[PDB]
């Protein structure tokens, strides 16, 4: 039809001559010419060749691909065949049938705004006003304040505060969908009850941004309002974030406090030996909280507090043991959040990241769902609060270099030195020499790493009413690492201690590793080899992204039909699931 192959003009007599029109022109021209020849006495060879040419033309029209090319003029590129309008990522299938460009909602960049609860999300006033414009007109007409759509447009164009509180009411429960750009797995799209904020950004709860694998490096998110009633109730029932805490891949909790909150708690649930207030007795967590807020005691000093850890002994019951436990005011304060469930023994430790995941998981297992989402919200709130109250900060003198490292190097250095003699005197073969250099360097690397750790993890030396004690370090670094907050020791020892060996482009290992570190500079060559490694990694990611995309597409296609339909097939054939063994441990 003429519609589906439109001839759209330009500012002047310039028309976008779609390839279909041009191919049709060519083929119909050949047809007319050939017919006119057929009536005109038909020289045999000529009609033969013209039939061949017409076959070629109709061929090209059905498919510019086979038998050669029919590239367009002035643009050395083929013409869009009919088949082209079907196949490829541009054909109607993968372009408008399966995934069609929606019309109804929004797009922006995101920020954090952690004041909001887990199910909420930010929303700019401008985007909101633009989206629910139909609901706006509806609420205005039903309120009679504008009984004509024209006046409704005028009012929404003038933003009289009436429109503002009308909008506030109209989205009071109206869920919406936040969507990352590449939606890898089921969580890539989720729902939230929006709230109105200023600016143009999209605030959202932190935990769920860790869910999307959504960093805040400027990553844009799309929004989608579900409009029909069935759809809204659906989005509230299924894809609202508060109903997806267990990742469908693995039943592990997907909402895990990742960073900047785990640090807070870990700092709170720690124990400085002799801090201000050690040795008191506290009449309850609220008591110790009052004590700490008034600055009369540290946030983490050993004390004795009475606590009533509620317990679900039998189903439905709740016993209350008003025991007298020895803890720290940090843990005493944090206890004010657990919802009458978990025993105290889950808060008494250093409370690292894995410990937080454990806490959330046992809370969910024991107390259903709603108390757990409340607990998670409170955990995030208090974590941010006490992190800010902490003031954890990384200064240059924090990452203390293990002083003996130098010596160690020289030793290993001197080591490889005489090994070169072993080769310069031909007493040992070349390959074994290479392996021996590698091995002495690896041993020196492990020794310097253990030196850095032993000088870092327990560097603190303090005194309790007396001589001296050795407690775990309060350094900024290793308060992020040991907490599991951000980056493991495999990066710290790379920072403070020796960076170690690095890889050749092929994968081989250079003889001389990077004796240097990061707190100390690097000689040019050292940075060069580090660049080798880093660029290899980056290229790997840059290709694997597209490769994995194509792979998961083939996957979702080959299994897009399996839907659990029957309830029990009633069979007996099973596979013998066994605890796997690989030659090492299980």
């Amino acid at each position: 039809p003429p519609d589906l192959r439109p001839l759209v003009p330009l500012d002047g007599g310039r028309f976008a001559t779609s390839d279909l029109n041009d191919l049709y022109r060519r083929v119909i021209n050949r047809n007319n010419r050939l017919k006119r020849l057929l009536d005109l006495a038909a020289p045999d060879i000529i009609v033969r060749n013209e039939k061949r040419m017409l076959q070629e033309a109709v061929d090209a029209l059905l498919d510019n691909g086979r038998r050669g090319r029919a590239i367009t003029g002035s643009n050395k590129r083929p013409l869009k065949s009919l088949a082209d309008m079907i196949k490829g990522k541009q054909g109607r299938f993968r372009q408008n049938l399966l995934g069609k460009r929606v019309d109804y909602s929004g797009r922006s960049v995101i920020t954090v705004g952690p004041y909001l609860r887990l199910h909420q999300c930010g929303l700019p006033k401008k985007m909101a006003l633009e989206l629910f414009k139909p609901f706006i007109y509806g609420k205005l007409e039903l309120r009679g304040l504008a009984t004509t759509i024209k006046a409704a447009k005028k009012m929404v164009e003038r933003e009289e505060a009436v429109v503002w509180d009308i909008l506030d009411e109209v989205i009071r429960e109206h869920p919406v969908l936040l969507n990352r750009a590449p939606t890898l797995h089921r969580l890539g799209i989720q729902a939230f009850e929006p709230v109105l904020i200023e600016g143009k950004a999209i605030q959202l709860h932190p935990l769920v941004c860790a869910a999307y694998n959504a960093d805040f490096d400027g990553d844009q998110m799309a929004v989608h309002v579900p409009l029909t009633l069935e759809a809204q109730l659906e989005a509230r029932a299924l894809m609202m974030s508060t109903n997806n805490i267990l990742s469908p891949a693995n039943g592990e909790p997907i909402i895990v406090p990742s960073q900047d909150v785990v640090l807070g708690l870990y700092y709170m649930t720690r124990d400085c030996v002799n801090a201000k207030g050690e040795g008191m007795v506290l009449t309850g967590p609220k008591e110790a909280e009052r004590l700490y807020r008034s600055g009369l005691a540290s946030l983490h000093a050993r004390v004795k507090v009475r606590i009533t850890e509620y317990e679900k002994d039998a189903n439905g019951e709740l016993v209350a043991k008003t025991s007298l436990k020895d803890t720290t005011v940090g843990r005493a304060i944090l206890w004010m959040i657990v919802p009458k469930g978990l025993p105290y023994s889950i808060v008494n430790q250093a409370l690292g990241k894995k410990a937080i995941s454990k806490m959330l998981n046992t809370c969910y297992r024991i107390l259903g769902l709603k108390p757990t989402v409340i607990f998670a919200d409170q955990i995030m709130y208090t974590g941010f609060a006490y992190a800010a109250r902490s003031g954890a900060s990384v200064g240059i003198d924090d990452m203390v270099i293990p002083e003996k490292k130098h010596e160690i190097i020289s030793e290993a250095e001197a080591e490889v030195a005489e090994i070169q003699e072993q080769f310069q005197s031909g007493l040992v073969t070349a390959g074994e020499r290479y392996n021996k250099v590698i091995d002495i360097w690896a041993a020196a690397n492990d020794r310097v790493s253990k030196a850095m750790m032993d000088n870092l993890q327990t560097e603190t030396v303090i005194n309790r009413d007396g001589q001296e004690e050795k407690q775990v370090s309060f350094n900024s670094i290793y308060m992020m690492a040991d907490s599991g907050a951000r980056g493991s020791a495999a990066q710290i020892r790379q920072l403070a201690g020796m960076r170690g060996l690095m890889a050749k482009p092929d994968g081989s290992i250079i003889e001389t590793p990077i004796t240097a570190n990061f707190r100390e500079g690097l000689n040019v060559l050292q940075y060069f080899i580090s660049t080798h490694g880093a660029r290899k990694g980056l290229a790997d990611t840059a290709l694997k992204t597209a490769n994995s995309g194509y792979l998961t597409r083939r996957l979702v296609d080959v299994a897009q039909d399996l839907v659990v339909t029957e309830d029990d097939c009633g069979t007996h054939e099973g596979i013998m699931m066994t605890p796997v063994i690989e030659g090492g441990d299980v």
């Binding site: 929606v102 929004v223 900047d260 990384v394």
Partner: protein, 1342 residues
């Protein structure tokens, strides 16, 4: 001591122990040097226009003895100029005129001409010159062509390790690639058989081409195999012997010589057996006849009287055939050495496979091969072959091609033929056969010595020659057909294809692109950019995971850091700082010529392979102050490696630490404390910075600012030194120093500073004059900072007081929290300038009209307009509003003359109006600041157009008026100081004004004579000024070129002042990107115990993971810098005595351990010291080189100089609680940019609006107010949940099913939520499209 008249304003304190030897070269060496290579009149023909000419010329006729050759060329002059071309929208053209001669030789006679016409300067095309910023000005915009990087045209050897036939059959193919022509290759069969082949055709049995070169099978084998002669003695089938020959493999029998039994019975000839056999000096062996088993014979055998072959060349030689030939002769027999270790019988086996054996047969074979289905005849195959190679026209290896070829074949002549030859082919074959053997060695394709760069110059002349060969063919045929001698050598050529080719290259090429012109650093790093894509180059899809890697030969040659993260990594590199292109196109790097023990300042520009052969020291290797390494086992690099060596084991030291990183990377402070995997994104972000209102110096800089600023074009560098006669907000007028000006030409020069002007990314560029008045500047100084530049130092972002601590999670992952103060001070509020062009076509109904009147819209929508429709300059427009103002001829087919005649007089202006005005796209506000107008001549002008014309006329007249003032003053001074000589007139030239000095009466011989002289001079001066004024008048008021029927192109400019706000993107200089997350009030922010708040609150947890400790160090140094600053501030708040401040600043500058610079502050005049101080109150800038940074001990010393604690950590007090934090936080002064990813360009929504025509789906793009692409993966994520109704309505009623969506909109406005899913219109589209083929497709009944 050597400080410029500008450096004295702010002398940057600098660390860096290493005293640099070679200053940073002109950062735009590539573009300028190469375009000079291309454009200048080269008398050598090695390259440039002359080379392309010598190639294409002399054109010859159909052997009609009428040739057309050249003698030389020349270039016209730009009719417009860079600002003229840049505003009027025309390319910076250059007329090309060539000196040709069409000679015709008499016939039928020997050579000589009886028919000839000389034509010099026939016009052929117009090439765009390179403006002095190393860029080009295509029509309107300013494009730049990046330098390409492609495999050196030549010969090399690939292995293809086991990736075929999967049995360790690595085939060492060898390919030869020319600078032009169809390349060639040889392959090893997976069964060890050679195969000559063309680019991609059927694999031929190799020896074919040897037979094609007129080779006899005898001579064939004589070029790849030995000759184990058999001087048949009286008995025993004698032969020669060298024990290496029989070394080989297992032996078969005792090979006794002279009777002495060396080879024991059996096998396993031992090295000791070989050794004693060599000891005996053996020269013969009795031999059993059966020993000869394979022994393929070389000489073909024929009886002495039968003529027939009796033993054919290269078939076999064995018992039967030997006994057979021994019934005729003989006395000579020779065969071919054979072995699996060496001298494999590949040539012989291929000749076995060889289909043809005759030369002409070989030519017809290759004739069918290259192009099948065609008549194989002798002459046709011969022409095809000897014009496939051996043809200077259709082939040329290269100059550098010949060089690389000869070197890769261990040849001697460094320069030779640019064309193949039989010896070169057989040498390639021989070396290849060796490569199959243990001998030789393959060479990679990533070694920089094999990949040459190729600038804009060579590529431009190549496109020139390519577009030239076609007009060459055309003019040859037109000279053939047409009358030989009836014409002038002026029209047989058609320059339209030449212009088309060159304009298509410079305008629409994969490499050409308008400059990334939003940031001086971005611009620079975009000029010296190396790519591997584009023509001749590989593409990113099939790029291969390998090539992207960095190769140890890159060190110092191409940056390993600066690289666009994304699909094209490694394929888009940036040239190193000190690097340079070779005379061929290779990458040379400067080194220092290490002599016996001295590291002399003598530099050498080493090539790649030259570096490979030598040993290279390390830049960081400290020295004993006399060229001698302090250490003894110094680290070094010899052959793509790293190892220690003795001080006498080295030959070349590095030149300076900086030569490894990019020019952009060079700008990164404390790089050596940072990891690459983050410094990369740091460099990228630095490229994507954005200019601000008042850019300021960065505190912690890398000293590279001077170069990157001045070597760019953004700063109006003073050309010739002098005194600042007159400054202004837009114009500078420099009176030249009395020496550096020509005898005439008072030549007081004028710098016209470009005011707010659009960028290729919609960023304002504004040069404010940084210089005072009356101050004297020397040659090559700064007179106007460009966008985001200060005092001639690259000033990208802002130095912000910043602390590293969490803050209620408002900096949760990496988001950045700021203080309303940073907004109130406008520290980041930037500008954006965007243009809107309303065009006026000429439809067949009639041309357009820009009349102010509009039939339908009211005065409210018209009030912003003038009588001419175009808006007043400065009217604050809002979205949706109408700028112009142009209506259109709407109707047709009325055909009522009785009304047409009415509306011929009453309505010819009011017949078919249709208001196709230009409205500002809804969403963007802004102030109009400028209106450019382009008119089609004939149509006079608009009142706005005429007004702008006269205004620009007056502007340009002002400068000539100034020059007239100064020349008039000089000449009247002359007439006074000369008229005095007599009269006397020494009291009337000064109280009586200039009324008639030219007419004052005195003596004649010289005095009235001098009056006559200066009268004629003054009058001709006025006259030439009038003439050039009229010339500017014409060049300004003349119409412009507008080809496709366009009358009035009205461009309007719009300036928006976009302030910072949540959602924007900010990043330091260490890849620590982030999104501004909250405009926290000034008081709520943390504040130091002296009251001063902290501006930005970053997130510390980002550091350990990202492993970029550098920034942290910088932060410390930052505070230290600022420390000094406030100190001086105190010294300036109260009027402290000068000498005190002088000594203090001096001591501050002498704080480093061993720094390269020793400023004295003596010979600084007092007010110069005060000026310097006033430019330091906001913090002493600190320069640290890239890889010689200030060790933290010096930072501690500096902080100690200030009154700030050494730990770089200060207690705080939350403005909310009022209490303190424990764990003293780290706070300093970090540099912070702002990227052009600000949220205003992203946030947009869509309730309902436009829809595509081909499918009733909504458009896409904020520009089109479109929706979002709910793509495949979103569909899958939905259907993973239940999400049935949601996905349903989203597919049908949200954005399809016109009836359905209209019903939805009409039903929801009535407060009812219900879907009416019909049919996706795109599905109807698919059905109709399939049905466009014979594929019937219906909907089932049920």
């Amino acid at each position: 001591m050597v400080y410029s008249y500008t450096e004295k304003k702010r002398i940057r304190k600098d660390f860096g122990k290493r005293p640099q030897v070679l200053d940073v070269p002109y950062l735009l060496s590539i573009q300028l040097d190469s375009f000079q290579k291309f454009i200048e009149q080269d008398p050598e023909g090695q390259y440039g226009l002359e080379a392309a000419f010598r190639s294409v010329f002399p054109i010859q006729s159909y052997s009609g003895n009428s040739e057309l050759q050249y003698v030389s060329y020349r270039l016209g002059e730009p009719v417009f100029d860079v600002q003229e071309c840049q505003i009027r929208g025309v390319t910076y053209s250059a007329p090309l005129r060539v000196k040709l001669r069409l000679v015709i030789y008499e016939r039928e006679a020997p050579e000589g001409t009886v028919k000839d016409i000389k034509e010099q300067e026939v016009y052929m095309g117009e090439i765009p010159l390179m403006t002095d910023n190393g860029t080009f000005v295509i029509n309107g915009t300013e494009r730049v062509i990046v330098s390409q990087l492609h495999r050196s045209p030549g010969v090399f050897f690939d292995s293809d390790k086991g990736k075929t036939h999967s049995s360790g059959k690595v085939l060492y193919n060898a390919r030869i690639i020319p600078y032009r022509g169809s390349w060639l290759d040889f392959e090893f069969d997976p069964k060890d058989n050679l195969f000559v082949r063309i680019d991609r055709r059927r694999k031929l049995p190799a020896t074919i081409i040897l037979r094609a070169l007129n080779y006899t099978t005898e001579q064939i084998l004589d070029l790849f195999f030995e000759k184990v002669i058999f001087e048949i003695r009286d008995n025993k089938l004698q032969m020669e012997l060298v024990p290496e020959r029989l070394r080989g493999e297992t032996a078969s029998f005792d090979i006794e010589a002279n009777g002495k039994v060396y080879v024991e019975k059996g096998r396993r000839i031992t090295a000791r057996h070989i050794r004693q056999l060599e000891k005996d000096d053996v020269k013969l062996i009795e031999v059993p006849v059966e020993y000869i088993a394979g022994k393929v014979v070389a000489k073909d055998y024929i009886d002495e009287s039968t003529g027939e072959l009796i033993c054919a060349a290269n078939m076999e030689l064995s018992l039967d055939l030997l006994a057979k030939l021994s019934q005729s002769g003989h006395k000579r027999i020779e065969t071919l050495f054979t072995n699996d270790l060496d001298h494999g019988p590949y040539i012989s086996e291929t000749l076995r496979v060889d289909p043809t054996n005759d030369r002409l047969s070989a030519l017809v074979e290759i004739y069918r091969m290259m192009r099948p289905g065609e008549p194989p005849t002798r002459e046709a195959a011969e022409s095809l072959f000897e014009n496939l190679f051996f043809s200077e026209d259709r082939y040329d290896l290269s100059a550098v091609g010949r060089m690389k070829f000869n070197r890769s074949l261990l040849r001697e002549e460094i320069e030779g033929s640019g064309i193949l030859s039989k010896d070169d082919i057989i040498d390639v074959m021989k070396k290849l056969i060796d490569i199959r053997n243990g001998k030789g060695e393959v060479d990679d394709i990533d070694h920089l010595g094999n990949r040459r760069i190729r600038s804009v110059g060579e590529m431009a002349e190549n496109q020139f020659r390519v577009g030239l060969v076609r007009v060459e063919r055309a003019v040859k045929e037109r000279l053939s057909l047409g009358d030989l001698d009836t014409l002038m050598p002026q029209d047989m050529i058609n320059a339209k294809p030449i212009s088309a080719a060159v304009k298509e290259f410079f305008g629409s090429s994969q490499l050409s692109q308008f400059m990334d012109q939003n940031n001086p650093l971005s611009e620079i790093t975009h000029k010296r950019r190396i790519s591997a894509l584009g023509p001749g180059g590989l593409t990113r899809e099939r790029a291969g995971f390998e090539v992207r890697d960095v190769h140890p030969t890159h060190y110092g040659r191409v940056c390993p850091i600066e690289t666009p993260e994304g699909p094209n990594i490694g394929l888009i590199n940036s040239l190193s700082v000190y690097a340079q292109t070779n005379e061929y196109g290779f990458l040379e790097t400067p080194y220092r010529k290490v002599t016996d023990g001295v590291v002399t300042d003598e530099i050498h520009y080493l090539s790649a392979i030259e570096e490979g052969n030598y040993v290279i020291a390390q830049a960081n290797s400290n020295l004993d102050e006399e060229g001698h390494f302090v250490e003894d086992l110094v680290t070094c690099r010899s052959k793509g490696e790293s190892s220690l060596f003795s001080r006498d084991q080295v030959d070349y030291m590095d030149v300076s630490t900086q030569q490894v990183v990019s020019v952009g990377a060079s700008l990164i402070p404390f790089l050596e404390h940072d990891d690459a995997n983050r410094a990369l994104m740091g460099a990228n972000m630095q490229r994507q910075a954005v200019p601000t209102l008042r850019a300021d110096k960065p505190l912690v800089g890398t000293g590279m600012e001077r170069a990157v600023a001045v070597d760019s074009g953004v700063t109006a560098v003073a050309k010739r030194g002098g005194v600042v006669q007159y400054v202004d907000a837009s114009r500078i007028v420099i009176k030249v120093n009395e020496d550096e000006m020509y005898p005439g030409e008072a030549g007081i020069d004028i710098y016209n500073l470009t005011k707010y002007t659009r960028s290729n990314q919609n960023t304002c560029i504004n040069q404010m004059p940084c210089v005072s008045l009356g101050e004297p500047v020397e040659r090559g100084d700064v007179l106007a900072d460009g966008p985001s530049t200060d005092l001639g130092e690259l000033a990208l972002g802002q130095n912000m007081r910043v602390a590293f601590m969490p803050w209620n999670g408002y900096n949760f992952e990496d988001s950045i929290l700021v203080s309303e103060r940073v907004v109130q001070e406008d520290r980041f509020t930037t500008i954006h300038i965007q243009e809107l062009a309303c065009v006026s076509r000429d439809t067949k109904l009639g041309p357009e009209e820009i009349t102010a009147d509009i039939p339908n819209v009211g005065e409210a929508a018209l009030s912003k307009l003038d009588e001419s429709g175009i808006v007043y300059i400065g009217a604050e427009v809002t979205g949706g509003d109408i700028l112009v103002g142009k209506v259109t001829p709407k109707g047709e087919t009325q055909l009522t003359p009785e009304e047409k005649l009415l509306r011929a007089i009453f309505g010819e202006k009011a017949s078919d109006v249709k208001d196709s005005s230009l409205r500002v796209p809804n969403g963007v506000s802004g102030t109009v600041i400028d209106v450019q107008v382009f008119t089609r001549d004939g149509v006079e002008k608009d009142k706005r157009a005429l007004e702008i014309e006269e205004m620009q006329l007056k502007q340009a007249k002002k400068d000539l008026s100034e020059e007239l003032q100064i020349l008039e003053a000089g000449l009247f001074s002359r007439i006074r100081a000369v008229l005095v000589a007599g009269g006397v007139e020494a009291e009337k030239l000064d109280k009586l004004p200039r009324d008639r000095w030219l007419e004052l009466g005195l003596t004649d011989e010289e005095k009235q004579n001098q009056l006559e002289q200066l009268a004629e001079q003054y009058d001709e001066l006025k006259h030439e000024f009038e003439k050039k004024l009229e010339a500017k008048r014409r060049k300004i008021t003349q119409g412009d070129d507008l080809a496709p029927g366009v009358l009035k192109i009205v461009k309007v400019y719009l300036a928006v002042k976009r302030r910072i706000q949540p959602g924007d993107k900010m990043a330091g200089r260490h890849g620590n990107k982030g999104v501004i997350s909250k405009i926290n009030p000034i008081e709520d922010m943390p504040y130091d115990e002296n009251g001063t708040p902290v501006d930005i609150v970053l997130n510390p947890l980002g550091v350990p993971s990202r492993m970029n400790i550098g920034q942290i160090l910088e932060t410390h140094l930052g505070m230290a810098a600022k420390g000094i600053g406030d100190k001086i501030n105190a010294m300036l708040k109260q009027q402290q005595e000068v000498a005190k401040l002088r000594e203090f600043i001096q001591r501050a500058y002498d704080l480093g351990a061993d720094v390269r610079q020793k400023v004295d502050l003596s010979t600084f005049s007092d007010e110069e010291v005060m000026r310097l101080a006033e430019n330091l109150r906001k913090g002493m800038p600190i320069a640290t080189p890239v890889f010689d940074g200030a060790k933290e001990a010096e930072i501690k010393e500096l902080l100690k100089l200030g009154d700030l604690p050494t730990s770089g950590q200060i207690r705080l007090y939350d403005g909310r609680t009022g209490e303190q934090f424990e764990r003293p936080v780290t706070v300093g002064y970090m540099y912070m940019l702002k990227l052009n990813h600000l949220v205003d360009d992203k946030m947009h929504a869509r309730s309902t609006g436009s829809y595509s025509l081909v499918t009733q789906q909504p458009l896409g793009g904020k520009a089109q107010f479109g929706g979002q692409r709910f793509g495949e993966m979103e569909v899958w994520a939905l259907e993973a949940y239940g999400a049935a109704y949601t996905l349903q309505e989203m597919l049908t009623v949200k954005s399809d099913d016109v009836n359905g969506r209209t019903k939805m909109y009409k039903n929801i406005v009535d407060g009812n939520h219900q879907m009416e899913p019909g049919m996706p219109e795109s599905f109807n589209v698919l059905l109709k499209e399939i049905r466009s083929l014979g594929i019937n497709i219906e909907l089932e009944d049920e």
